Amino acid sequence: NLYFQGASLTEIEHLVQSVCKSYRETCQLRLEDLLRQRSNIFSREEVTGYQRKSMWEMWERCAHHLTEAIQYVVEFAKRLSGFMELCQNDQIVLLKAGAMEVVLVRMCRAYNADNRTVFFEGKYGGMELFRALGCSELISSIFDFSHSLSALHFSEDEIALYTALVLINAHRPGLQEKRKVEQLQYNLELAFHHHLCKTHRQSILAKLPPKGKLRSLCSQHVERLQIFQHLHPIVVQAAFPPLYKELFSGGKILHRLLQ
Ligand SMILES: C=C(C)[C@@H]1CC[C@]2(C(=O)O)CC[C@]3(C)[C@H](CC[C@@H]4[C@@]5(C)CC[C@H](O)C(C)(C)[C@@H]5CC[C@]43C)[C@@H]12
């Protein structure tokens, strides 16, 4: 929109409010409900039930909860200034490469660093809950990532502006209108940095996760998905969500959602 060109301070400050609004309207669960349900945690019997579940059933349940989270990320993008003004090829390029990374950041709200548990299917559970997945190295890496993010003590507004920058990334391979994405990213970084300056919160800039860790977590996920697909190809074909397979398994629901 406007933010495909240079922006004044006043336009930057209103971009802050716009992004913070779009995130408030499109976050799956409210922070207050997540924090308040930390007292209810899975029993040792319930954890065993999850661990004794079959691998392909666990993978399918997790793929559906992941797809649900992606759907709110897509709606977040559609409410972001300039995203719908972009061409549809670039919209799909940004979502295909960022929607998972955004979910990985949003996840720190559902994570409790006090006991290293995460809110999953109604209760809080540690990473042993997912032992039936057979990717304990990836699970551990994601729990560590949420742990380091929780150390930053994000506000909701900070998560809003950070995840906006995760999505609007002009370096994604395949962008057709790169410079126009470059300007949108530039204005969104001013909005982010303006908010941190105003709230005396710039010290977190040097504490943010490095660029290659969100990309590395996403690669590990595609890595483990291909290993699961080789072991259970009909499960993926018959029971995985279409949006999930479009994003992480090559071969169009994004087209529909974007319109
Ligand atoms: C089985 C697969 C499709 C994924 C492959 C391994 C995996 C990965 O993505 O790396 C390991 C992390 C998990 C288990 C994903 C599946 C989605 C979930 C989920 C967002 C679901 C909704 C929940 O409320 C909560 C926010 C707590 C989790 C956080 C943990 C991950 C990201 C799996």
Side-chain angles (χ1 to χ4, degrees), residues 215-227:
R215 202 169 45 233
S216 162
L217 286 165
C218 286
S219 293
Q220 277 174 261
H221 162 241
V222 177
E223 166 204 289
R224 303 311 296 196
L225 172 61
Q226 285 151 355
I227 287 178

Side-chain angles (χ1 to χ4, degrees), residues 5-43 46-178 180-197 199-250:
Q5 282 297 319
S8 79
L9 176 79
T10 297
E11 295 164 355
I12 290 297
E13 295 189 304
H14 289 125
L15 184 56
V16 169
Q17 297 286 92
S18 158
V19 171
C20 289
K21 182 181 175 185
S22 311
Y23 167 78
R24 269 198 316 269
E25 291 174 337
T26 64
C27 63
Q28 214 161 349
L29 282 162
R30 278 176 318 134
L31 188 66
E32 81 190 8
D33 283 323
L34 270 168
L35 287 170
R36 175 260 173 280
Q37 201 153 344
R38 291 153 102 191
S39 60
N40 163 325
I41 301 167
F42 283 110
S43 69
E46 283 170 306
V47 175
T48 290
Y50 278 107
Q51 295 171 336
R52 303 260 162 251
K53 259 167 199 302
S54 80
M55 181 186 271
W56 71 270
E57 265 163 335
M58 203 50 191
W59 263 90
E60 193 205 320
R61 298 257 277 265
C62 289
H64 265 289
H65 295 294
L66 182 55
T67 302
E68 278 146 28
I70 303 281
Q71 274 160 1
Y72 286 93
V73 169
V74 167
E75 192 64 28
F76 168 68
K78 294 182 59 216
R79 286 165 207 225
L80 265 189
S81 281
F83 184 81
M84 300 303 312
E85 288 55 52
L86 294 167
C87 77
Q88 193 173 72
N89 173 87
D90 292 2
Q91 290 173 18
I92 304 192
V93 164
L94 293 175
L95 281 168
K96 212 180 273 182
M100 187 49 164
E101 319 195 342
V102 171
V103 162
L104 292 173
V105 176
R106 284 178 160 206
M107 173 177 38
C108 73
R109 300 159 77 237
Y111 175 80
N112 186 5
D114 280 356
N115 54 1
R116 291 173 198 267
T117 67
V118 71
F119 185 77
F120 181 83
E121 285 192 355
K123 303 175 162 233
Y124 270 88
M127 76 183 145
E128 76 267 354
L129 209 64
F130 311 89
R131 196 170 287 159
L133 286 179
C135 48
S136 76
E137 172 153 354
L138 172 57
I139 289 283
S140 185
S141 292
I142 281 160
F143 268 67
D144 292 343
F145 182 71
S146 286
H147 199 92
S148 60
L149 282 190
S150 82
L152 301 198
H153 308 295
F154 276 135
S155 69
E156 293 290 276
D157 289 356
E158 283 172 343
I159 282 170
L161 304 151
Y162 181 56
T163 52
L165 285 177
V166 168
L167 262 172
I168 309 302
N169 178 351
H171 290 328
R172 303 298 200 197
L175 293 174
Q176 281 171 1
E177 311 186 276
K178 188 174 182 185
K180 185 170 76 180
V181 180
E182 298 188 348
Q183 194 54 52
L184 190 44
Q185 175 184 341
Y186 181 68
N187 286 322
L188 284 170
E189 271 174 345
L190 288 183
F192 190 27
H193 289 51
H194 174 69
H195 183 78
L196 295 176
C197 194
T199 59
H200 313 279
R201 278 284 284 171
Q202 66 87 12
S203 55
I204 69 168
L205 276 177
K207 277 149 200 151
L208 288 177
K211 283 76 191 160
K213 181 146 67 154
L214 274 177
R215 202 169 45 233
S216 162
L217 286 165
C218 286
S219 293
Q220 277 174 261
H221 162 241
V222 177
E223 166 204 289
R224 303 311 296 196
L225 172 61
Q226 285 151 355
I227 287 178
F228 174 81
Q229 188 150 8
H230 170 105
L231 285 168
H232 298 88
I234 314 293
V235 175
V236 170
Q237 186 182 357
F240 273 43
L243 184 52
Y244 182 90
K245 297 183 283 191
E246 186 183 313
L247 287 169
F248 310 116
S249 179

